[PDB]
Write an enzyme that holds these catalytic residues in place. Structure first.
Site, mmCIF file in Angstrom:
data_model
loop_
_atom_site.group_PDB
_atom_site.id
_atom_site.type_symbol
_atom_site.label_atom_id
_atom_site.label_comp_id
_atom_site.label_asym_id
_atom_site.label_seq_id
_atom_site.Cartn_x
_atom_site.Cartn_y
_atom_site.Cartn_z
ATOM 1 N N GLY A 65 34.217 42.196 46.733
ATOM 2 C CA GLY A 65 33.732 42.665 45.447
ATOM 3 C C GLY A 65 32.221 42.629 45.390
ATOM 4 N N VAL A 78 37.222 38.162 49.029
ATOM 5 C CA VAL A 78 38.568 37.693 48.680
ATOM 6 C C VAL A 78 39.527 37.555 49.867
ATOM 7 C CG1 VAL A 78 40.460 37.871 47.051
ATOM 8 C CG2 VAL A 78 38.262 38.788 46.445
ATOM 9 N N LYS A 81 38.694 33.509 46.107
ATOM 10 C CA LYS A 81 37.423 34.209 45.973
ATOM 11 C C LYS A 81 36.262 33.249 46.182
ATOM 12 C CE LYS A 81 34.652 37.013 42.807
ATOM 13 N NZ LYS A 81 34.634 37.754 41.500
ATOM 14 N N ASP A 141 33.183 45.810 34.048
ATOM 15 C CA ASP A 141 33.460 46.343 35.374
ATOM 16 C C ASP A 141 34.898 46.840 35.505
ATOM 17 O OD1 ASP A 141 32.842 46.948 38.121
ATOM 18 O OD2 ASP A 141 33.738 45.006 38.690
HETATM 19 C C1 LIG Z 1 48.860 44.170 53.701
HETATM 20 N N1 LIG Z 1 48.738 43.862 52.227
HETATM 21 C C2 LIG Z 1 47.463 43.754 51.475
HETATM 22 C C3 LIG Z 1 47.791 43.791 49.992
HETATM 23 C C4 LIG Z 1 46.802 43.335 48.920
HETATM 24 C C5 LIG Z 1 45.306 43.495 49.195
HETATM 25 C C6 LIG Z 1 44.323 43.317 48.050
HETATM 26 C C7 LIG Z 1 44.647 42.202 47.061
HETATM 27 C C8 LIG Z 1 46.039 41.565 47.192
HETATM 28 C C9 LIG Z 1 47.170 42.142 48.042
HETATM 29 N N2 LIG Z 1 46.138 40.601 46.070
HETATM 30 C C10 LIG Z 1 44.820 40.376 45.444
HETATM 31 C C11 LIG Z 1 44.349 39.191 44.628
HETATM 32 C C12 LIG Z 1 45.389 38.249 44.098
HETATM 33 N N3 LIG Z 1 44.955 37.431 42.939
HETATM 34 O O1 LIG Z 1 46.429 37.912 45.010
HETATM 35 C C13 LIG Z 1 42.976 39.361 44.018
HETATM 36 N N4 LIG Z 1 42.166 40.542 44.334
HETATM 37 C C14 LIG Z 1 42.438 41.344 45.550
HETATM 38 N N5 LIG Z 1 41.530 42.468 45.853
HETATM 39 C C15 LIG Z 1 40.170 42.448 45.288
HETATM 40 C C16 LIG Z 1 39.166 42.994 46.314
HETATM 41 C C17 LIG Z 1 37.787 43.195 45.697
HETATM 42 C C18 LIG Z 1 37.866 44.019 44.402
HETATM 43 C C19 LIG Z 1 38.762 43.313 43.393
HETATM 44 C C20 LIG Z 1 40.176 43.193 43.957
HETATM 45 C C21 LIG Z 1 43.830 41.285 46.145
HETATM 46 C C22 LIG Z 1 49.293 43.987 49.981
HETATM 47 N N6 LIG Z 1 49.865 44.043 51.352
#
Ligand SMILES: Cn1cc(-c2ccc3c(c2)[nH]c2c(C(N)=O)cnc(NC4CCCCC4)c23)cn1
Length: 287
Positions: A18, A23, A42, A136
């Site tokens: 981000g 993360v 994070k 955001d």
């Molecule tokens: C292979 N695989 C990957 C996913 C998949 C990949 C991405 C995310 C994911 C599961 N679960 C979340 C969590 C959560 N609290 O668990 C918080 N933010 C994330 N992404 C952030 C990146 C920066 C911008 C804000 C959002 C992720 C599903 N399968």
């Protein structure tokens, strides 16, 4: 309880990056058997005092929040050498609404898109009652728990409204309301604006060509300079330049979008209002 022990947090994979945060998917596994809970972590991408101070505030902010459509705070984790500081959160298995919608569009109809829409509205309403401005809002920041629940998943640029004033004065310009652009003023109203843009992203089902940065660039022309992009967007917004009604989108839906995209701050609808309308629009759909 809210305290997590760094040695028991096993890395698994990266999930994303981000604004200044990174993360990771981790297992918190004290028994060492791999039965521990998978959670989301994070931390400061690259740590400095200001960012830490900011980040600690992000943490206090998320700690602040209980709600169905806001990702769950679990705890914090202090690194030795105080080099990192980590925010620990419930893991949602589907990633962002951006990518989820991006590839399971076949089974997502207008009906679901509105369940998602009201949920987001409620979260923001509540955010709103705490005097917090997200700043955001966007599908990439909204997370999918399962097909029936999405949650606002990042608060990395969230601010507290000063006690009296109704706006904050201090990234992603194609989600910004115009007074945020020109005067750098953010508010509940500037969030409703961005929410209009999220509403748009939703009913475009995230074709990459139909993204807001794309559509607006198709207006600003891809020939303009650097800072000249903002300036042209402003002008365009000043004269009621607006994103199009996406393919197949009901004007009832589009009408909210444009209502949110009102040059006049006060004419912009409330999240309270917005949630009710959407819900009603939903009910109607009967097939
Ligand atoms: C292979 N695989 C990957 C996913 C998949 C990949 C991405 C995310 C994911 C599961 N679960 C979340 C969590 C959560 N609290 O668990 C918080 N933010 C994330 N992404 C952030 C990146 C920066 C911008 C804000 C959002 C992720 C599903 N399968």
């Amino acid at each position: 309880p809210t305290q997590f022990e760094e040695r028991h947090l096993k890395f698994l994979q990266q999930l994303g990056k981000g604004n200044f945060g990174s993360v990771e998917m981790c297992r918190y596994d004290p028994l060492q058997d791999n039965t521990g809970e998978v959670v989301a972590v994070k931390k400061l991408q690259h740590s400095t005092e200001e960012h830490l101070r900011d980040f600690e505030r992000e943490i206090e902010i998320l700690k602040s929040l209980q709600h169905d459509n806001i990702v769950k705070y679990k705890g914090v984790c202090y690194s030795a050498g105080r080099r990192n500081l980590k925010l620990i959160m419930e893991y949602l298995p589907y990633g962002s609404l951006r990518d989820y919608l991006q590839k399971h569009k076949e089974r997502i109809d207008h009906i679901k898109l509105l369940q998602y829409t009201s949920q987001i509205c409620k979260g923001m309403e509540y955010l709103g009652t705490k005097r917090y401005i997200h700043r955001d809002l966007a599908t990439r920041n909204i997370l999918v728990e399962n097909e029936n629940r999405v949650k606002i998943g990042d608060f990395g640029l969230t601010k507290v409204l000063p006690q009296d004033k109704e706006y904050y004065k201090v990234s992603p310009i194609f989600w910004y309301a115009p007074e945020s652009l020109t005067e750098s003023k953010f508010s509940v109203a500037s969030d409703v604006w961005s929410f209009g843009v999220v509403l748009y992203e939703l009913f475009t089902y995230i074709e990459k060509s139909k993204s807001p940065p794309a559509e607006f660039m198709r207006m600003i022309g891809n020939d303009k300079q650097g800072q000249m992009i903002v300036f042209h967007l402003i002008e365009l917004l000043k004269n009621n330049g607006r994103l199009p009604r996406p393919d197949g989108c009901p004007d009832e839906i589009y009408m909210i979008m444009t209502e949110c995209w009102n040059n006049n701050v006060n004419q912009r609808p409330s999240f309270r209002d917005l949630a009710l309308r959407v819900d009603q629009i939903r009910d109607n759909m009967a097939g």
